[PDB]
Amino acid sequence: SEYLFTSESVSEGHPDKVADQVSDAILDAILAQDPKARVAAETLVNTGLCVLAGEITTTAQVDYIKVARETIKRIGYNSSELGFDANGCAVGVYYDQQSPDIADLNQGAGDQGLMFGYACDETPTLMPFAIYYSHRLMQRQSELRKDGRLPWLRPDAKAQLTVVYDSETGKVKRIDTVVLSTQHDPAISQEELSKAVIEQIIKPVLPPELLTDETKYLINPTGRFVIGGPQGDCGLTGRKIIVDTYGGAAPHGGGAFSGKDPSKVDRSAAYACRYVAKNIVAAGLATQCQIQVSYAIGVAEPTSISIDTFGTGKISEEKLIALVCEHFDLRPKGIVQMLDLLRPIYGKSAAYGHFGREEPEFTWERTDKAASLKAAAGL
Amino acid sequence: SEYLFTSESVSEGHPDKVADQVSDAILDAILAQDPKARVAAETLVNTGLCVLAGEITTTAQVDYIKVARETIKRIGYNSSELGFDANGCAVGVYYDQQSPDLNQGAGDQGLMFGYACDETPTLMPFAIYYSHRLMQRQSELRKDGRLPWLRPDAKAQLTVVYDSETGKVKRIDTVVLSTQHDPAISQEELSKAVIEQIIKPVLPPELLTDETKYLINPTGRFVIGGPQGDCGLTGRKIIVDTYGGAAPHGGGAFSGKDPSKVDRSAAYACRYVAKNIVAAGLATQCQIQVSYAIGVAEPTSISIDTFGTGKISEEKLIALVCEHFDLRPKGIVQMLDLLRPIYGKSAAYGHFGREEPEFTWERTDKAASLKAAAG
Numbered sequence: 149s150e151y152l153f154t155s156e157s158v159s160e161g162h163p164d165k166v167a168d169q170v171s172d173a174i175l176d177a178i179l180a181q182d183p184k185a186r187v188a189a190e191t192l193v194n195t196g197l198c199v200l201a202g203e204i205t206t207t208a209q210v211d212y213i214k215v216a217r218e219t220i221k222r223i224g225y226n227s228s229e230l231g232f233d234a235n236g237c238a239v240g241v242y243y244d245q246q247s248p249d250i251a252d253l254n255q256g257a258g259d260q261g262l263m264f265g266y267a268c269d270e271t272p273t274l275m276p277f278a279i280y281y282s283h284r285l286m287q288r289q290s291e292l293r294k295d296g297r298l299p300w301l302r303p304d305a306k307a308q309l310t311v312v313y314d315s316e317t318g319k320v321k322r323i324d325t326v327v328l329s330t331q332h333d334p335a336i337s338q339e340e341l342s343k344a345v346i347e348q349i350i351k352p353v354l355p356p357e358l359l360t361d362e363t364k365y366l367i368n369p370t371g372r373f374v375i376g377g378p379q380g381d382c383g384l385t386g387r388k389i390i391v392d393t394y395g396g397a398a399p400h401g402g403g404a405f406s407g408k409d410p411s412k413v414d415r416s417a418a419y420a421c422r423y424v425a426k427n428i429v430a431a432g433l434a435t436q437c438q439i440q441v442s443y444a445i446g447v448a449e450p451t452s453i454s455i456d457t458f459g460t461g462k463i464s465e466e467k468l469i470a471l472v473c474e475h476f477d478l479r480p481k482g483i484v485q486m487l488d489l490l491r492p493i494y495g496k497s498a499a500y501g502h503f504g505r506e507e508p509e510f511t512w513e514r515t516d517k518a519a520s521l522k523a524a525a526g527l
Numbered sequence: 528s529e530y531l532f533t534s535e536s537v538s539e540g541h542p543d544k545v546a547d548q549v550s551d552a553i554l555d556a557i558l559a560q561d562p563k564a565r566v567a568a569e570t571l572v573n574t575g576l577c578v579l580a581g582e583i584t585t586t587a588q589v590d591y592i593k594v595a596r597e598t599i600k601r602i603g604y605n606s607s608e609l610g611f612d613a614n615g616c617a618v619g620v621y622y623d624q625q626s627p628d629l630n631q632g633a634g635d636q637g638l639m640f641g642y643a644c645d646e647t648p649t650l651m652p653f654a655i656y657y658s659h660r661l662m663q664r665q666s667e668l669r670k671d672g673r674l675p676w677l678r679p680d681a682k683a684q685l686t687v688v689y690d691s692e693t694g695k696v697k698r699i700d701t702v703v704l705s706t707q708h709d710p711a712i713s714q715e716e717l718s719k720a721v722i723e724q725i726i727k728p729v730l731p732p733e734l735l736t737d738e739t740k741y742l743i744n745p746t747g748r749f750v751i752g753g754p755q756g757d758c759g760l761t762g763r764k765i766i767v768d769t770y771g772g773a774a775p776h777g778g779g780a781f782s783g784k785d786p787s788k789v790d791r792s793a794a795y796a797c798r799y800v801a802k803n804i805v806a807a808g809l810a811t812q813c814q815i816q817v818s819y820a821i822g823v824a825e826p827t828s829i830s831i832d833t834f835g836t837g838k839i840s841e842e843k844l845i846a847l848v849c850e851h852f853d854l855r856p857k858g859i860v861q862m863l864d865l866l867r868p869i870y871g872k873s874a875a876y877g878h879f880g881r882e883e884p885e886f887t888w889e890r891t892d893k894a895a896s897l898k899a900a901a902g
């Protein structure tokens with residue numbers, strides 16, 4: 149009668165997310181000076197280490213080492229006690245120029261590849277339930293840390309949500325398990341930590357009606373969590389792509405987002421697909437919607453597009469594809485104009501998810517086409 | 528009536544794949560001496576650069592630089608002209624290296640996915656299966672000198688047309704293939720050679736119609752390649768590594784991780800289950816979702832979607848799964864005999880859908896028992 153689904157998120161202090169944030173901080177720094185820059189910035193962090201590598205073509209004059217250090221500092225890795233310290237880490241710059249062999253609305257894609265977008269009616273921002281609330285658990289951890297309301301919190305943290313679904317209706321019934329692990333100063337006991345995490349992080353974020361007497365709260369299940377981040381651990385750009393998107397509720401095409409300028413369809417087409425699927429759901433034309441597109445390097449129009457409403461569509465998926473092609477320009481330059489992407493808006497996207505946050509920067513979360521799609525379908 | 532679906536693959540010379548292959552070659556070298564080793568080996572490649580980083584707990588004594596250079600050499604990066612050269616690149620080792628129950632419970636809440644279907648001989652979705660084959664063919668003709676101007680780095684992408692109610696492939700709509708090459712060959716000669724000698728020998732002839740589009744090196748030149756043209760990282764091809772987007776993915780990368788990482792071992796077991804169900808004829812399309820709870824060894828929940836193709840009920844398939852497979856985290860290691868240097872081959876051309884003897888999770892060795900048990 150019921151089935152389980154689990155998703156997870158990680159804080160801005162997780163080593164993979166540190167690498168993502170450094171990559172997009174560098175992207176933003178470049179885009180502030182040179183909106184047309186070509187950027188493919190990869191980051192590896194490890195013990196005392198931040199390697200910057202990849203291909204950049206720009207007129208911007210950016211101090212990459214200072215930007216990387218400032219990013220790590222603002223995440224919270226700025227004191228000796230934490231092992232990893234922006235003041236005492238080596239930053240090495242190994243950037244190349246962009247390959248000339250790789251290098252107006254009909255300009256070609258930067259690469260081949262496939263991309264998925266998704267939306268559903270499970271949450272206020274039209275996200276699947278488990279990833280939406282997993283991200284908000286980590287954001288809440290970060291919020292309390294940075295303003296000092298829980299001053300013993302440290303940067304690295306992880307959340308997991310196991311949710312019980314009704315097999316027939318498909319709706320969320322209850323939350324089965326919450327897992328919350330957080331780094332912390334060594335002087336706080338696990339018991340004090342657990343009580344504060346439940347009162348201040350878990351209960352203020354999750355819907356009260358879905359926390360029952362059967363809900364399991366697993367706080368720091370492996371014990372104390374004093375050292376974290378890149379101290380004795382490695383982080384890499386693009387190693388949290390499922391956390392970054394829909395948490396396993398939808399397929400993924402494989403491309404990472406962070407460190408890539410908006411001419412990389414890996415990022416821009418994934419954002420467009422979210423925008424398309426979200427406006428279809430906000431238009432009331434489906435309660436679940438999934439889209440796949442693909443490109444060929446050096447071709448403008450997508451080599452394929454498909455839409456699935458999983459039986460919830462009020463019109464055929466054929467008709468929806470026609471609506472989409474009339475209302476959205478999915479050529480790479482069309483997407484950039486559609487979403488106003490040539491702006492230093494990406495640093496915030498690189499932790500706590502690229503989708504489901506209706507921030508002014510995140511144009512692909514706007515539902516400004518829903519009404520137009522609703523009327524155009526005859527509804 | 529019909530819909531499109533697209534997947535892609537890359538050759539062993541793609542820089543993300545170079546990093547995966549170095550990571551798992553190092554894993555294999557460690558496991559050969561120390562089957563119980565803990566390994567989390569991350570690789571970054573760029574111009575003249577191979578960075579080795581991560582955590583290793585082993586008694587093995589491995590020359591990591593030599594293993595990395597030999598792997599890069601075997602891939603074909605043998606000249607500074609390519610910006611990446613096994614003999615001349617810098618290899619830097621940053622590993623934090625330390626020296627050092629079937630009912631052990633899980634350490635994380637887990638959701639893992641596995642998938643199989645009857646679309647291809649090894650029971651894989653069509654698009655990913657043939658994209659891998661396109662890339663292996665490129666590698667093969669480069670290595671045996673039939674097309675000596677080929678260089679290691681290449682990608683392929685297939686857009687396939689499916690029937691909306693049948694679920695069967697009806698034709699191939701678009702084939703994309705980009706390959707690195709020696710500068711001297713013209714694009715006209717390269718394109719003809721790729722179509723006639725790589726694409727046509729690999730794809731089913733009856734699915735290549737007059738409407739099939741061929742896009743070969745659509746940039747117009749592909750001399751610069753490998754890590755110089757594109758920085759490569761371990762774990763950046765996880766969809767290439769699995770089902771090409773035909774099934775959801777839970778998140779984690781495979782290469783560089785020993786089998787104690789459920790990101791790798793549980794993904795392998797889920798594929799093993801789904802493949803054997805399909806090979807038992809109990810379904811023509813099968814997605815399994817397996818849940819774990821912290822501190823519980825046996826899975827807490829199993830879902831099996833046969834998409835209306837199941838010959839018995841989902842409840843009955845789940846009962847057969849629980850009886851015929853050990854899905855406990857350490858039971859999987861035993862069931863698939865995973866503590867062996869078998870991973871280097873998995874790190875290019877897909878972890879799933881190849882019936883190499885190393886790949887215990889691709890054996891259909893339980894299909895006859897399943898079909899027998901179902902009736």
Ligand SMILES: Nc1ncnc2c1ncn2[C@@H]1O[C@H](COP(=O)(O)O)[C@@H](O)[C@H]1O
Nearest residue numbers: 249250541542680681705746748749757
């Ligand atoms: N001039 C080119 N034409 C076609 N493909 C290329 C060219 N230069 C690089 N590539 C490929 O594009 C890949 C990018 O794949 P990824 O970034 O992993 O999606 C590179 O690793 C190369 O295999």
Ligand SMILES: [Mg+2]
Nearest residue numbers: 543759760763
């Ligand atoms: Mg990549």
